[model samples]
Target chain A: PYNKIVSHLLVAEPEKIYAMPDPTVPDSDIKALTTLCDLADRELVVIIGWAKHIPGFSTLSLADQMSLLQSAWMEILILGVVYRSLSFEDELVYADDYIMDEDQSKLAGLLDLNNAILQLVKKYKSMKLEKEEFVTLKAIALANSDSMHIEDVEAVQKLQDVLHEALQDYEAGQHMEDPRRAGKMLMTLPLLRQTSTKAVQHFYNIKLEG
Target chain B: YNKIVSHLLVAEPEKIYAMPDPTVPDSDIKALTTLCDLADRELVVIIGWAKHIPGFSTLSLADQMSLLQSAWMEILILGVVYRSLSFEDELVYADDYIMDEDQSKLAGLLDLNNAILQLVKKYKSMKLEKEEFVTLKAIALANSDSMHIEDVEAVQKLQDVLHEALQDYEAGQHMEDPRRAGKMLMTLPLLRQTSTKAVQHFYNIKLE
Candidate 1:
């Protein structure tokens, strides 16, 4: 019954989490669950909420939301680079505070969410390789790996290299594949260049397949 | 006795002009003439003589020479002027180069010489008064009249004025006068005022 309640609660609109219209679940219990979701997805959710709350974001048609979401995804992917390089210690602290400070929990939660997404890329690659999902795993690995730090320099250089390769492939009109993927890769190019310089002197060096 | 006779004769010096040598008198000429005959009577003789005019011997050698030279030149100049004024231009050159009798050129030259002499005299007399020095400079600038005269004297005059003015100004300021030091300080304000006017006047003259 508790599992059923939790599953049902997860499916509900996130905004409705704080104020449940259903009389079945007690308001206190609903509040507790809402707090838990807030803690769990604090960083990602807060960013998403902020993005939505910004004037004219929700007023945009559904098509615009999807289009904006595509850009948002690219932004998130680039942020993953920083996420992957965040110390494990930061991640834990980030996760702990994610649920508590709704208004003030931005830094911790976003930071942890970013790490989690980056780790997901790594986990996806590991799973793909184990299941002999060679094509899918290769794509995931290529996307997530510190391409520039193949020799222990910086992650951005690798990201830039991948982005450039993807752009070149698109320009050649050879791999006319996923436009979204190409767009995401292209967008990460600048981040790779900018952050690599910063990462070399400071920040964690992300090593993939190590 | 009639077959063995011989005779020696002496020639007397003939007075050519009335001008006589003061050192050797009328009697000595006959003796000197006989000596020349003994040496070589047939050979042509040239006699050169000079005599000091009275009161001339009393002067220093330089003054004596200067007075003589100046008198001769002044006479020649007067002769030229007299002839030029009395005769026509065509006839004036017919004789020797004579002075312009109108004396316009001489007057101009004398005026300039006088102006210069006056400057020197004033510069010597005034003990370097500021107003007098400035007046002297104005007189010089006016007299220079676009002629390329030596600027050194003018420059010296300016230096004197500067030194004198600076000495006075410094004394007035309750500072002791140091040789070039006061001049140097005074020059700053003096030049700052005068130079601007000088430059303006110079350019205006150039335009004219």
Candidate 2:
């Protein structure tokens, strides 16, 4: 059911993750972390770029913007990785293929998240999500529903409401009229949130000796 | 700022306490008490979170207090939604009444309908993993528009660190696109708005 609308998304990730080889202490730690930041800066641009396309997103006041980014950045980051991993044919892939299985994530102190992401990866692969679904997921990511004091919480609700309705409509067009299917897709969001949110609260002390 | 991403992760509700249990015919009374308890715990959670928000203590007590009071309902709405992540559609609260999703149609709990109470149940039914729940907590608390907040550069660093932790999460892992991802975040706001409207309903006329 993924129509041309979905395919048009930025399938080509302009950037990718880098895993330091035999990643050691201070050297690789700072390098990897810094590289990670550089990577995020790029992703931020991507998210922002994509976010701008949402009808009402840019009109949001700056305060709400900062709040949304702070709250959901970690969430959206995990989502992007989750989507990327869906493409791997074998052992799970992540950030430049640095961490593969749960074992590797455990070492990096990502104890619970790797397991969580795996579940989601499985779900997405099973769902066989089209590009359109994934794209809106990104747009929805712009909605920090729980953020403290969004000036127009209603505004966010309305924006996401329209987008989600559009998703349902997309499904409707496919005659996959089963709202449950749409429900299930929406359902996956929380799982991703659980993975990303837990990861954010989770720490990453990946320094050799730093 | 620290610890369990799944703190809200309660063991799955032992049993969906139906409205009129065979035993507690007066379940609604009990449910009311529980709702009260729910109200108190959420406020505590709200203050507890605001209290430790890095430079919270640096603000005047009034400022801190103001911040707490200002967003108290929003946070509690968030808590109620998070707690109810399971009892989808309908449930019996306090063993006295039945609140269904239909009643909850504030259009978004924007109505303050009694149905808002069902959010906790419906949410529970959804069974969001802990990570999303935690993230939802942050999103629910994104009231950076607080009057007490200095709105200066100082608090900006906090935002960066918060966001970076997420970035650290991404680079450390790999990460999503747009549309489909967006739908999920959409569910979260409904809880807040629904809860907000619902709370007002509770306030408009005490639930007996």
Best candidate (score: TM-score): 2
In order, what lDDT does every prediction score?
Answer: 0.29, 0.52
lDDT score at residue B197, model 2, on the 0-100 scale: 48
Q: Which consecutive 10 residues in model 2 chain A have the weakest lDDT in total?
A: A201-210
* Model 2 misplacement above 4 A: A1-38, A89-92, A96-99, A175-179, A204-210, B1-208
- Every model's DockQ, to 2 decimals? 0.00, 0.05
Tens digit of lDDT per residue, candidate 1, span B63-161?
A: 433333322322222222222333332112113222232332332333322222222221232244333222222222221111122343443343334
lDDT of 2 at B127: 53
TM-score of chain B of each: 0.19, 0.54
Write one digit per residue (lDDT tens) for candidate 2, span A1-210. Answer: 553433434453245545434445443334444545666677777666565555566777778877787677776777777777787743345566544565544544444556667767876787787667777676665564356556766666666666666666677676454434554466466556555644644443233234
